[PDB]
Each structure stands twice: as C-alpha cells, then as structure tokens.
Design a protein around this ligand. Structure first.
Ligand code: RS8
Length: 262
C-alpha cells in the first residue's frame, strides 16, 4: 500500500499542507468529482490491493508509528508501532477480512474489542473532543503515546485521546479544507487548542453533508443542514456552493444522477 510520511519535528504550515495534499491524492482519483468536490472510491467491488493507504508519522523524539487509512472513508482502522499492530473492532466480516491484508509482516497482531468512533474513544479518554487540545505539540505527544502502548507506558485514556488527536489532524483535515486550515493555524503559531463548534459540527456532519450533496437537485439540498459557527451560533446550509471551500472529500453514497445539462 502507498505510504505518506509526516513529521511533527520542525513542522510548518507548508510541510503540513504538503502532507494533507498527498493524503488526499492517495485517497482519491479524479474519477468522481461532483460540484467541484471529489468523492472517495466506492466500497462496492473495490479490490483489496486498492483498499488502504499508510500514514507514517514521525516525531522529534525519533519515534515512528504507521496509521492505516481505509480509502473509502479516510477512517483510521488501526496502527503499527514496531513489532505490534492494533486494529479497532471491525464493523463487519468483510472489514475484518480486509485488515488481515495490513501489516502482514508484524509479529504481534491485536484487535481491540472497542470500535474506533469518536463516541467510544471519548468514553475511553474520559474527555470529549471539545476538551482535547489539537496542534503540533498534541500530535508529537500522540505519536509517542501510540509508540509506547505495547510496552505498558501508555494508559488506555491517553491512547484514546491520542487516537482522537491523530484522527482529527489527519483524516478530518483530509476531509475538510476548513479543518486543514484550523490545524495550519495551530501549527503556524505553535499553540495548541481544542476544536471549536465549527470544527466539531463539520466532523459530525461529514456523512450527512456527503449524502445531501450527492442527493441534491443541481446542488440544492431538499433539507437544510445546520452547522455551527466558531461562537456556537447556527449556520444553515442550503446548497453545495457554500461548501466548496469547506469540504475536500466526500464518502461515496451513490452513482451521480445523469448529467442535468439543459
Ligand atoms: N478511527 C477513526 N477514524 C476516523 O477517520 C474517524 N472519523 C470519524 C469518526 C466519528 O466518530 N465521527 C462522528 C460522526 O458523527 N461520524 C459520522 C460521519 C462519518 C465520519 C467518518 C466516516 C464515515 C462517516 C458517522 O459515523 O456516520 N470516527 C473516526 N474514527
């Protein structure tokens, strides 16, 4: 599987931007672009050799971990640190089979009994996303925490917190230019901060936004989607147009309707 490298060591806006762009480039082809917004490959009939990408994360502490991302949804399905690999509890038998194709040379393979969704990870972390700081420092620390899990150095709440950091700074940033921008800001000033309601509501709405765009009538939503601004106030989305600078990738929901051209 293709590997994309990022390091927190001396990270800049440019090096992070290069990284996120490269992740997007490995997640998607140019085959499926709707209202200027790329769609991830359809799960249905996707060959196993095209199913995953690998994100090799290094830090200033000279430690490396490799995340495995599912190309169908940019989901972090598990990770490798040295001679151990850990996978989140699969949703189904097909996904369970799929992950057997990841880190095949690794000495120790584990599947967590828990799923990798935010709700579960927040429960285990003892903190919600809104109270978990993001930025280069948190990511540096997250890489170390993932690295030391197999040897007993990392408590489960810290591991869960560290997953939450990685997921948002990689997968969510890939999904949303807006979230990429929010991480760029944190990196630029080297100041960690928890995600505000604009970030949280985008994350929570990714599936619904993807479906609404794909089901839209020439871009127009049948039902508006409510997001939140930075201050927590409501922002109503009626149309794909407003989302073009915000959403970089969509999960596949359906084949697009025939070209609507007059
Ligand atoms: N491990 C992991 N990798 C991710 O990329 C990821 N990305 C997102 C979430 C998550 O709970 N999101 C909250 C949410 O409301 N998700 C929606 C939208 C969605 C997000 C990601 C993938 C598919 C759908 C849903 O589950 O329906 N969890 C993740 N866990």
């Amino acid at each position: 599987y293709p590997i994309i490298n990022f390091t927190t060591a001396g990270a800049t806006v440019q090096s992070y931007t290069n990284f996120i762009r490269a992740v997007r480039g490995r997640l998607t082809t140019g085959a499926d672009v709707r209202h200027e917004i790329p769609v991830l490959p359809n799960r249905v009939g996707l060959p196993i050799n095209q199913r995953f990408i690998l994100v090799e994360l290094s830090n200033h502490a000279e430690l490396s971990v490799t995340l495995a991302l599912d190309v169908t949804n940019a989901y972090v399905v598990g990770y490798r640190a040295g001679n151990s690999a850990y996978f989140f509890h699969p949703d189904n038998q097909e996904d369970a089979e799929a992950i057997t194709h990841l880190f095949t040379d690794v000495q120790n393979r584990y599947t967590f009994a828990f799923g990798g969704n935010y709700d579960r990870l927040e429960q285990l972390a003892g903190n919600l996303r809104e109270n978990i700081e993001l930025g280069n420092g948190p990511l540096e620390e997250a890489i170390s925490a993932l690295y030391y899990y197999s040897t007993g150095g990392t408590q489960l709440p810290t591991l869960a917190r560290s997953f939450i950091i990685c997921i948002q700074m990689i997968s969510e940033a890939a999904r949303f230019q807006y979230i990429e921008g929010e991480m760029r800001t944190r990196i630029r000033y080297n100041r960690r901060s928890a995600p505000d309601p604009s970030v949280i509501t985008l994350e929570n709405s990714w599936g619904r936004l993807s479906t609404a765009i794909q089901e839209s009538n020439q871009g127009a939503f049948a039902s508006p989607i409510q997001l939140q601004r930075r201050n927590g106030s409501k922002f109503s989305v009626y149309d794909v147009s407003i989302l073009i600078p915000i959403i970089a990738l969509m999960v596949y929901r359906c084949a697009p309707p025939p070209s609507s051209q007059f």
